[PDB]
Design a binder for this molecule. Structure first.
Ligand SMILES: [Mg+2]
Ligand SMILES: [Mg+2]
Lengths: 311, 311
């Protein structure tokens, strides 16, 4: 798989261009500040009187309404939540973006699942940071220089150091949603919760349940992060390693789990997940909100709060 | 549940006593150094010509053979791997420990599962560190002051600050083994591996598979560590939160998972796990070793190594 570094990227493909960063969350913040520091002509498009409007000015960046920022720009980088992007593109980017302009993202969801259908004259590309490596993709190369522009942008925000990996909007979006659903968030919270409940129902103090099923996860994952599974197994006690090897499959059996995870991936790949999430947003996200309240009330949180407090 | 702090512990119950720390891993190191710094009379019992022998002297601690260290001690703190403790106790602690001495641990496994059967004249207790709180337990109080000694020991190594929680050898050992098996190590590695394989078999680049199923786990777990599930859900994108809520149970279903985890706990509570692990050690740990080689060869490691290298 193809990796690019600082020397592979040519800042001449960006330094000559005016960049509009829409949004000023953590991503909008980091993108905009690093562009300026790399000496790119950058403005931030925000709604007047917003909290992030004041915050952007405070950081010393030039700030305009979204429509204005876009009229000024050669390159529009959209750093807004997925569910807000479509409306902003339709009503404010698309009428105001120069012929042959570039439209950029950090997440491929909106373009990959057809929520934003870019004008045919635009370049469309993505730089997705994570020694922070980054992913790059080009969905549409109208100018003929989409790719070197994207690479220049990546260097200019500092992602090139640890390496830029070329992918597609498809691969970035699908694997991102899969990871969240199956492993990182969905799967992990369910494992933790089943373990916590198992211990509490068996008569153990909730505090110790929380230690052994929640608090300690960080120790293990930090080892994996630094040195892979192999390194994690090497650092823990032999008792714990033996336990892992011999009981792990009982907790989480391989073929049944992969079967389920294939169905999660199928709902992603088929467009079904995307449809469901977009429809959910059209009627005020009541499933999101109901689930949020219900998980907030889970006894794991009470115990968690009390323990973090006393530590 | 009952919590103790620095003001609840009285260093007079330890400062008057000679402590032998057997072993000089990370725990033996931290225990011994902090005891000395709190002004406790401490020696480290090690085998002559060992790597940890030289390392202990280098740190400025007084070092003796195990038999000698024990003859000098009022309190013997055993900080060795589970599978080595029994032999050292039988052959070197038990013949040499004063009448009415104290025998201490950081892990309850050996005493809880009968691998060490302490003389009836001994105090037996445990201080188990994790703003590092600690667990304390007393298995045997021959002197009548086991508990305040244990608390003094905990303060003297610095565990009292963030709080000492009173438990039993039983609860500490069983929940520790359960967490390892079901969630922290066994369960988590299986989830990660099923997700990684799902993505690779579906045609995605292994690099991105690794990002979305392994590398990123740290971001999520760091949020949970700092602010619980609730806080983690609050920080991630709404798309990711919605995903978690609606697909997590498919990946890891609640009742089947808890059923399996009850069986893991039953094998712990029944003594079966302890028996298996002890027998395993009696014939050179061939299951441990076979599993270690097989997991080392899993393609997740190759991909992992290459990615960590380039970052
Ligand atoms: Mg594509
Ligand atoms: Mg007990």
């Amino acid at each position: 798989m193809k990796i690019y570094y600082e020397h592979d990227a040519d800042l001449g493909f960006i330094l000559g261009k005016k960049v509009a960063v829409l949004g000023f969350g953590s991503q909008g913040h980091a993108h905009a500040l690093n562009l300026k520091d790399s000496g790119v002509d950058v403005r931030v498009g925000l709604r007047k009187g917003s909290r992030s409007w004041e915050k952007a000015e405070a950081a010393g960046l030039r700030v305009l309404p979204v429509a204005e920022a876009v009229r000024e720009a050669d390159v529009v980088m959209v750093l807004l939540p997925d569910e807000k992007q479509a409306q902003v593109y339709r009503e404010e980017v698309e009428p105001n973006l120069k012929e042959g302009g570039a439209l950029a993202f950090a997440h491929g969801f909106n373009v990959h699942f057809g929520q934003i259908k870019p004008r045919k004259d635009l370049d469309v590309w993505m730089v997705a940071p994570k020694g922070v490596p980054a992913l790059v993709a080009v969905h549409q190369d109208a100018s003929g220089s989409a790719f070197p522009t994207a690479l220049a942008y990546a260097k200019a925000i500092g992602a090139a150091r640890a390496g830029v990996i070329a992918t597609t909007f498809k691969d970035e979006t699908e694997t991102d949603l899969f990871g969240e659903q199956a492993v990182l968030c969905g799967g992990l919270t369910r494992l933790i919760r089943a373990g916590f409940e198992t211990l509490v129902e068996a008569g153990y103090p909730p505090e110790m349940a929380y230690f052994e099923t929640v608090h300690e996860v960080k120790l293990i994952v930090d080892l994996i992060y630094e040195a892979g599974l192999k390194g994690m197994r090497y650092s823990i006690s032999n008792t714990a390693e033996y336990g892992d090897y011999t009981r792990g499959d009982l907790a989480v059996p391989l073929e049944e789990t992969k079967r389920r995870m294939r169905e999660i991936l199928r709902q992603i790949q088929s467009g079904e997940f995307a449809r469901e999430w977009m429809l959910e947003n059209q009627v005020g996200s009541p499933v999101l909100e109901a689930n949020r309240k219900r998980w907030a009330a889970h006894p794991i949180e009470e115990v968690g709060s009390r323990l973090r407090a006393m530590m």
